[PDB]
Write a protein that binds this ligand. Structure first.
Ligand code: NI
Ligand code: NI
Lengths: 177, 177
């Protein structure tokens, strides 16, 4: 219909902003970009942006929300380490600036990300790779999660990076117990 | 000896500021500190503060050469483990505000610190505790250093900290591959 077409048009403009925000997050810190940057790409004016997004803050939120739903909140039937590999797969191509988001140190992205790791990566990592029990649980939790995040950051700064499977390997052997 | 008297007054003023700077670092962190606050505590004039230190940076500099010379490059006749106990012992007590520098996240301290581990802790840690060329060196090095620094940071953010003995032990039985 004639409302069918206007809808299809508000849906394409919402995506333009979304995609603009991502492309700009490839070159800049979240703290460093401004709504005018976001328009200058989206080609949609100040008034309409604010009709979809209360502020820049809900793009980060939405984005993350999306990025983390695709990484973890999958019921995609695979082995634990296929699951790890897929996660790492996204980082190495910087699927939607996810790498740049992590390397930027944006405190908010680093927070919600560490929290997903706690819910969907740690419990399996624990039960499946750590066999002994002479190291307390909290030290375990902290050493494991933090060394995962740090292995990952280091790999992303690497100009010549190992295959995701090599890194997943060298990490799992480093921590297994 | 009135030039001997003059030197003596210079010296007393200089450490008087240096001590104040350390004191302010116990709570507030480096970036949030001013000449006002240092001189208020050191009970000194702004003109005199400046004939001693170009700025609050040359203080951070000097404080840093001091702490590491002490922590690391000491030719004390101890075994590698005693050595690390002494380093951990400093952070446990916040000796010269050192625990607070680290937890402050200040680029300058952190950068200098890491560089010192790299040079004085990593070589022995890896030789003494790693007996498996199963893993490539660079990966090995990145992983040990980050695990140390973060286990350090983690321990320090603890409400009821564990003993430096338990920490070093759990750390070491964790990387020992
Ligand atoms: Ni995918
Ligand atoms: Ni000492």
């Amino acid at each position: 219909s004639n409302a069918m077409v206007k809808d299809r048009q508000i849906q394409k403009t919402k995506v333009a902003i979304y995609n603009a925000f991502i492309s700009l997050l490839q070159e800049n810190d979240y703290s460093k970009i401004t709504v005018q940057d976001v328009i200058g790409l989206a080609n949609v004016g100040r008034s309409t942006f604010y009709s979809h997004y209360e502020s820049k803050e809900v793009l980060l939120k939405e984005l993350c929300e999306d990025l983390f739903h695709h990484l973890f909140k999958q019921g995609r039937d695979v082995t634990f380490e296929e699951y790890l590999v897929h996660i790492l797969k996204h980082f190495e191509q910087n699927q939607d600036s996810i790498a740049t988001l992590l390397l930027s140190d944006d405190p908010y992205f680093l927070l919600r990300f560490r929290s997903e790791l706690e819910h969907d990566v740690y419990p399996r990592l624990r039960e499946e790779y750590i066999t002994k029990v002479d190291i307390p649980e909290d030290f375990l939790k902290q050493f494991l999660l933090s060394s995962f995040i740090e292995t990952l950051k280091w790999w992303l700064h690497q100009r010549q990076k190992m295959t995701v499977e090599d890194l997943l390997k060298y990490y799992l052997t480093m921590v297994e117990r």
